Design a protein around this ligand. Structure first.
Ligand SMILES: *Cc1ccc(CNC(=O)c2ccc(C(=O)O)c(-c3c4ccc(=[N+](C)C)cc-4oc4cc(N(C)C)ccc34)c2)cc1
Ligand SMILES: [Zn+2]
Length: 158
């Protein structure tokens, strides 16, 4: 029950609506086909597409989607995925479940990821099925393959 502003921006994947309150960025939507949090979001995202050399030098906006408010399994998944899976790497679902404190919760990791409010920022596209299988993507498989090809990964396809 937040009150939020909305920014927009051009991307190699279409136009990207950013939504967020004062306490933090809520969502990042893709359509395609001001305040500090969203100011840092728009900056980071262009750092990602156009100057990825030093993506790690742009700061990560605070996040205030409800999923991050109280503790959950979904929150530990998303928070750990953001902290450890860097640009250029990937992680299997099964191994992300282990990283989030339950090596047998792969199905729950799959579901935790489907409700990610801020793609790329939280790198849900770096979570693959296996060494040779990139898996699905809730943004569309070609997006995932694009993003991984953008990061130079062997499972990318542009
Ligand atoms: C990590 C991550 C999460 C979310 C996105 C962006 N995707 C969406 O926001 C999103 C919104 C709504 C739908 C929807 O169907 O209403 C989807 C979506 C699917 C979401 C989850 C899913 N599984 C968990 C199996 C499957 C989805 O399939 C979709 C299919 C279509 N079409 C066939 C048109 C459209 C939307 C789908 C996604 C990005 C990254
Ligand atoms: Zn909020």
């Amino acid at each position: 029950d937040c009150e939020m502003k909305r920014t927009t921006l051009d991307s190699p994947l279409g136009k990207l609506e950013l939504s967020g309150c004062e306490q933090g960025l809520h969502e990042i939507i893709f359509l395609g086909k001001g305040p500090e949090p969203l100011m840092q979001a728009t900056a980071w995202l262009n750092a990602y597409f156009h100057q990825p050399e030093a993506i790690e030098e742009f700061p990560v906006p605070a996040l205030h989607h409800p999923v991050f408010q109280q503790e959950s399994f979904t929150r530990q998944v998303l928070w750990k995925l953001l902290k450890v899976v860097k640009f250029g790497e990937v992680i299997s679902y099964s191994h992300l479940a282990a990283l989030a404190g339950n090596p047998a919760a792969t199905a729950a990791v799959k579901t935790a990821l489907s409700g990610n409010p801020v793609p790329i920022l939280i790198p849900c596209h770096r979570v693959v099925q296996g060494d040779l299988d990139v898996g699905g993507y809730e943004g569309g498989l070609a997006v995932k393959e694009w993003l991984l090809a953008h990061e130079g990964h062997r499972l990318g396809k542009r």
